Amino acid sequence: NGVCCGYKLCHPC
Known part of the structure; x- marks a missing residue:
């Protein structure tokens, strides 16, 4: 979900 x-x-991270 998190984008890095x-x-x-x-x-995504």
Whole structure:
């Protein structure tokens, strides 16, 4: 449910 953006790429945590 939570979205975490990594190396310029957002995705679920």
